[PDB]
Design an enzyme around this catalytic site. Structure first.
Site, PDB file in Angstrom:
ATOM      1  N   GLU A 155       0.913  -1.129   0.000  1.00 28.34           N
ATOM      2  CA  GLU A 155       0.000   0.000   0.000  1.00 28.34           C
ATOM      3  C   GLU A 155       0.953   1.179   0.000  1.00 28.34           C
ATOM      4  O   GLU A 155       1.718   1.390   0.946  1.00 28.34           O
ATOM      5  CB  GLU A 155      -0.903   0.039   1.222  1.00 28.34           C
ATOM      6  CG  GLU A 155      -1.941   1.144   1.092  1.00 28.34           C
ATOM      7  CD  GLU A 155      -2.775   1.316   2.343  1.00 28.34           C
ATOM      8  OE1 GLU A 155      -2.184   1.318   3.445  1.00 28.34           O
ATOM      9  OE2 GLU A 155      -4.015   1.460   2.218  1.00 28.34           O
TER      10      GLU A 155
ATOM     11  N   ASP B  42      -4.599  11.651   7.878  1.00 29.63           N
ATOM     12  CA  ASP B  42      -3.431  10.932   8.362  1.00 29.63           C
ATOM     13  C   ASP B  42      -2.876  11.478   9.664  1.00 29.63           C
ATOM     14  O   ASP B  42      -2.964  12.675   9.935  1.00 29.63           O
ATOM     15  CB  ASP B  42      -2.326  10.963   7.303  1.00 29.63           C
ATOM     16  CG  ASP B  42      -2.599  10.012   6.154  1.00 29.63           C
ATOM     17  OD1 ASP B  42      -2.461   8.788   6.364  1.00 29.63           O
ATOM     18  OD2 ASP B  42      -2.952  10.490   5.053  1.00 29.63           O
TER      19      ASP B  42
ATOM     20  N   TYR C  95     -10.858  -2.475   3.212  1.00 31.30           N
ATOM     21  CA  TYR C  95      -9.956  -1.943   4.219  1.00 31.30           C
ATOM     22  C   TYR C  95     -10.749  -1.810   5.509  1.00 31.30           C
ATOM     23  O   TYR C  95     -11.558  -0.891   5.661  1.00 31.30           O
ATOM     24  CB  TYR C  95      -9.420  -0.584   3.771  1.00 31.30           C
ATOM     25  CG  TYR C  95      -8.170  -0.122   4.487  1.00 31.30           C
ATOM     26  CD1 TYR C  95      -8.173   0.135   5.859  1.00 31.30           C
ATOM     27  CD2 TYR C  95      -6.993   0.102   3.781  1.00 31.30           C
ATOM     28  CE1 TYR C  95      -7.028   0.614   6.506  1.00 31.30           C
ATOM     29  CE2 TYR C  95      -5.857   0.578   4.417  1.00 31.30           C
ATOM     30  CZ  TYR C  95      -5.881   0.831   5.776  1.00 31.30           C
ATOM     31  OH  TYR C  95      -4.751   1.307   6.393  1.00 31.30           O
TER      32      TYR C  95
END
Ligand SMILES: *Cc1c(COP(=O)(O)O)cnc(C)c1O
Ligand SMILES: *Cc1c(COP(=O)(O)O)cnc(C)c1O
Ligand code: NA
Ligand code: NA
Lengths: 391, 249, 391, 249
Positions: free
Chosen positions: D49, D60, D175
């Site tokens: 990834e 993030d 995911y």
């Protein structure tokens, strides 16, 4: 010979050189005329409303009084154009100057708030404005000095004497002595020679009139007391005026106690000074045993007037109004308290009024009382001062 | 006493005008001030107008404002001024002595007490700069009780009503800043003040019908200019006053 | 699935990580509920009126337009509590947070005005407030930082990325991603993911509603055009909203031109940027050819949002609203002009709007036109900035 | 291609879980990044990834935010990342390669063009961090047209409706940030992300019913910690990945 009584009991009068008396009589005559002139009233109401932002709000502060039987309201003059109540009366005096066919304005200022108010009114009404400010104050009020110039006013430092407000007060009168034909002296507080104490009160009385109407609307009754700081006396007499004949309403004036009355470092002439004759009036003064005029000290530069309006000294003498003092520390605590619990940053001047109200509440938390504090101005200007002190 | 009356009668008996210089008591120092004053008198001053330093002389120009600064810098107080006044009177028995005061120094410890103190040291008149005739009652009453002539300024922008009042309330001399009307109302002899800084203005004043002239700041300017040299200060003061007095003759 | 359309034409949407969608749906649902709840409306009206000072004045500026056929009015949001229009919507969002049973507030700020507004609303309504501010902005806005803390808000510097507003914007969302259960993200402009553009517009729409009522009262007709600066789009959409269906009324948005469009040093993404997807929405953005987000430059730190509300991009696309730009120098001149001729110190942000109005007037002085400039805020805060530049 | 399908089938044929490490392309440099990646693969990574540095990665944490800072400090651009992707695919023909993108880098020069570029360099999947399934239409459509599996995150606060959508719209792998319901809706094999930093979490993921686990930041932390020594960085990366992969067996 005057049209109105120049005295409030033994206080007041017109203690100016003979050469200035015609200017004062002329001014008194114009004011009396203007007061009975509906067109003048309408024009003044229009500026107050559409330019300055009146009526101002009456804010109920619930967080601050939680757990007590005190209901507190703040008359929001901090929301007035310019950030203080000063604006109300300069607009009125500017209109008076024009009514007299005057084209220039002379003004005095210590902390700079009045200088800025005179300058903005002069800009709006096409008046040439010159302001006197003590060199010592010029040095410590650069922001307000630039604001004045940005608005087209001519700022003139005063190095004579203590180079503070009182010295600016003398210099203004000197100038006016020989220019009153075309210039109007826009005095900054409810003091000085008659007719100024009367004129300033009348041009600030909407504070109390609005407060009365607002409190009746919201509570259905008058306040138990209205509280205001007293530097020279304008915001206080402004708030008090309309309530004077309402005997059940306490009038509380708060003078700056500085580092503490007993330290001699304060600005509370009304209750701790001595009657003298200065700045055109007989009133309580900060002075030496010899008769020399002294400065008033306070963490708040706006409460620097070394004397007090004659109408307050009179209201105190007959017991209609009560005057107390609040120290720098008490005012600093009230300042932080308002910021944290109501999200309003009060002027350090106003904080003195608030601090006394807080004391009335805290000392007797079970006493049911409806109080109104006149929040004379906003304290963005005090952010630095408070900053240093903290931590 | 009647020092002003005696002065003006004597001046008239010789078609002479009076020259009155003004100085600030204690400027630039007590010692130097006393010498300055003795010099002014030896030089020909007919009367004196003396200022008592005050913190906020809102009725004075830069010359006087600075004079007070010098005096205060010397630690001069009203009490010291009165000690000086006593000394001056003890040396000169007949010269009229007038004080130029600010209301607060008079009102401070009681108006009557102030004028009583004036009489005790031998002062002849008192002009209170910030007390218009409209507010003068307690002052002139106190002055008269203590044989002190209350002096009033007759401003340029005056009117007939003010003229009648000034004539009725004043004594000693009228401080002119018109002359026919004053004489018409039996006012005290008029002295021309403001702008008296050259001999021709003195002669012009007497010629106009005034009893004399007062030099409100010229004297102080000479002091200001010779602060570095006390001896030159006295010398220049003598020449100036001598020149101004001769012009009144 | 949403209750309201998240798009304005091709612009808008909800471009946030999946984990944030429930928070946005929850928020949208609460807003729709609140909008139809008279009690919520009354409570919001009460704060606006008695706490913030609404309605604000509509000031006619005669001196500035003398000699021309332009009649200019300034909607006085500079008189709003806090000194800017920011206060209107934070009060509404604070009430929404409480309605959702939230007790904490997360807010982002560049120049600090929004941070201060979020902090004062949080103080008033008993909400724990934490504000994210780019370290670079923290360094250059000490005054506003202290005001925030004085009001009990926790200020957190952001050193990531360019350490400016956009970086503060990301950090806020990050925090909210994992705290939205008890915390509400009080976004500062009419941008970001749906329902924020809609919510902010609705909570700022009283600006235009009041302006309409006031202008009809004073002129008996609608403005030919209303002009407002556009940083993110809140004060502008606030002013525009109520006039959108009034086709005869021009809507003019003013983006900061900085040192000049051709210099590339500006903050005018709507007319000179490129559509992108960032901060939860598809809108015109300041970005590199590669797709990296850039900062917006302007003499005025408040016009720093590197994008623009999606409703403005839409209004521009269909031609309902026109957008122009004003450079630093044009805004500085408008700032000085207002101070000198009307005695009002405008925020440098607002000065851009004023500068364009001045241009409309000056370029065609014989054109009869009735304009309203939204004076979004006061410029006391800009006194230093302007000071340095002058002389 | 069907690299994910082939990987999962092969992993299942040996009751093995997949270990997918994440790194930021170009962190801390292009050269070093390529080596890091080759190391991750030699150490046992089943798929990769890869993040493309973006100015405002609002989805993030600090580890990744700093990784982008290092990459940008190295002058890494999307164009360079794609050159890297090409090189990586040319060296490893079968390992699935997934990109973690931000909507703007995908939308910038046209969505279709982005996915076309992905197919050209041999990328297998794309997860767009700030595009919820609600806004994914143009993205998944473009992905499918170019044989790119669109990846979606199944958040903790998900509901049945989101689960049905993710199962219907995703490909390659889901995911995961529940497993029974996903299998029930025939969703792509689920990989456990978030918090995968020790071998036991890998074993726990496979034991829970997931097809594998993704180490979203642990790899980046090792890089961050060994910036001073490139050689020690690779050595520690090898040990970590080797340990994580063995736990999936
Ligand atoms: C000037 C000022 C005062 C003091 O003046 P008053 O004449 O006594 O009112 C009080 N509050 C504020 C905010 C001021 O600016
Ligand atoms: C914050 C601010 C702006 C810019 O924000 P918008 O959301 O575009 O209105 C404009 N004017 C003032 C005074 C501001 O504080
Ligand atoms: Na005082
Ligand atoms: Na913008």
């Amino acid at each position: 010979t005057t049209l109105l009584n120049p005295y409030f009991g033994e206080f007041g009068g017109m203690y100016v050189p003979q050469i200035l008396m015609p200017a004062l009589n002329q001014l008194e005559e114009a004011f009396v005329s203007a007061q009975k002139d509906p067109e003048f009233q309408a024009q003044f109401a229009d500026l107050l409303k559409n330019y300055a932002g009146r009526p101002t709000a009456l804010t109920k502060c619930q967080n601050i009084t939680a757990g007590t039987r005190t209901t507190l309201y703040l008359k929001r003059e901090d929301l007035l154009h310019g950030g203080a109540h000063k604006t109300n009366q300069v607009l009125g005096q500017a209109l008076l100057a024009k009514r007299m066919g005057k084209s220039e304005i002379i003004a005095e200022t210590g902390a700079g708030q009045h200088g800025v108010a005179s300058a903005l009114a002069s800009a709006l009404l096409g008046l040439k404005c010159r302001i006197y400010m003590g060199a010592k104050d010029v040095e410590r009020q650069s922001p307000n000095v630039f604001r004045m110039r940005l608005m087209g006013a001519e700022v003139i430092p005063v190095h004579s004497g203590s180079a503070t407000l009182k010295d600016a007060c003398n210099e203004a009168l000197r100038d006016w002595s020989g220019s009153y034909e075309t210039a109007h002296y826009m005095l900054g507080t409810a003091a000085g020679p008659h007719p100024y104490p009367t004129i300033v009160r009348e041009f600030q009385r909407m504070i109390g009139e609005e407060t009365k109407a607002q409190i009746l609307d919201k509570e259905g009754r008058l306040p138990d007391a209205v509280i205001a700081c007293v530097g020279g006396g304008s915001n206080a007499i402004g708030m008090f005026a309309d309530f004077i004949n309402d005997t059940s309403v306490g009038l509380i004036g708060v003078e700056p106690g500085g580092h503490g009355i007993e330290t001699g470092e304060h600005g509370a002439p009304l209750k701790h000074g001595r009657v003298g004759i200065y700045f055109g009036m007989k009133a309580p003064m900060m002075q030496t045993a010899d008769g020399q005029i002294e400065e008033s000290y306070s963490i708040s530069a706006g409460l620097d007037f070394p004397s007090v309006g004659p109408q307050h000294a009179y209201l105190n003498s007959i017991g209609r109004a009560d005057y107390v003092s609040i120290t720098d520390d008490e005012a600093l605590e009230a300042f932080k308290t308002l910021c944290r619990h109501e999200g309003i940053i009060p002027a350090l001047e106003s904080s003195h009024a608030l601090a006394h109200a807080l004391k009335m509440m805290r000392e007797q938390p079970e006493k049911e009382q409806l109080l109104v504090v006149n929040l004379s101005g906003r304290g963005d200007k005090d952010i630095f001062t408070v900053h240093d002190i903290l931590k | 006493m009647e020092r002003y009356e005696n002065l003006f009668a004597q001046l008239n008996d010789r078609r002479e005008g009076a020259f009155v210089p003004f100085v600030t008591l204690g400027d630039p120092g007590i010692e130097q001030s006393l010498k300055i004053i003795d010099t002014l008198i030896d030089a020909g001053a007919d009367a004196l107008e003396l200022g008592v330093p005050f913190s906020d002389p809102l009725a004075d120009g830069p010359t006087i404002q600075n004079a007070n600064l010098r005096a205060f810098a010397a630690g001069v107080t009203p009490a010291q001024c009165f000690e000086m006044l006593a000394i001056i009177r003890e040396k000169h028995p007949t010269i009229p002595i007038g004080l130029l005061m600010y209301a607060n120094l008079v009102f401070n410890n009681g108006i009557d007490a102030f004028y009583a103190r004036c009489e005790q040291v031998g002062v002849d008149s008192v002009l209170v700069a910030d007390v218009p005739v409209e507010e003068s009652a307690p002052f002139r009453q106190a002055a008269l009780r203590h044989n002190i002539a209350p002096i009033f300024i007759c401003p340029p922008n005056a009117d007939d009503d003010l003229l009648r009042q000034v004539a009725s309330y004043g004594r000693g001399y009228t401080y002119l800043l018109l002359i026919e009307k004053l004489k018409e109302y039996h006012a005290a002899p008029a002295l021309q003040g403001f702008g008296i800084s050259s001999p021709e203005q003195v002669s012009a004043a007497v010629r106009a019908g005034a009893a004399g002239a007062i030099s409100g700041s010229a004297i102080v300017k000479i002091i200001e200019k010779n602060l570095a040299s006390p001896k030159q200060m006295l010398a220049e003061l003598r020449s100036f006053v001598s020149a101004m007095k001769a012009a009144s003759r």
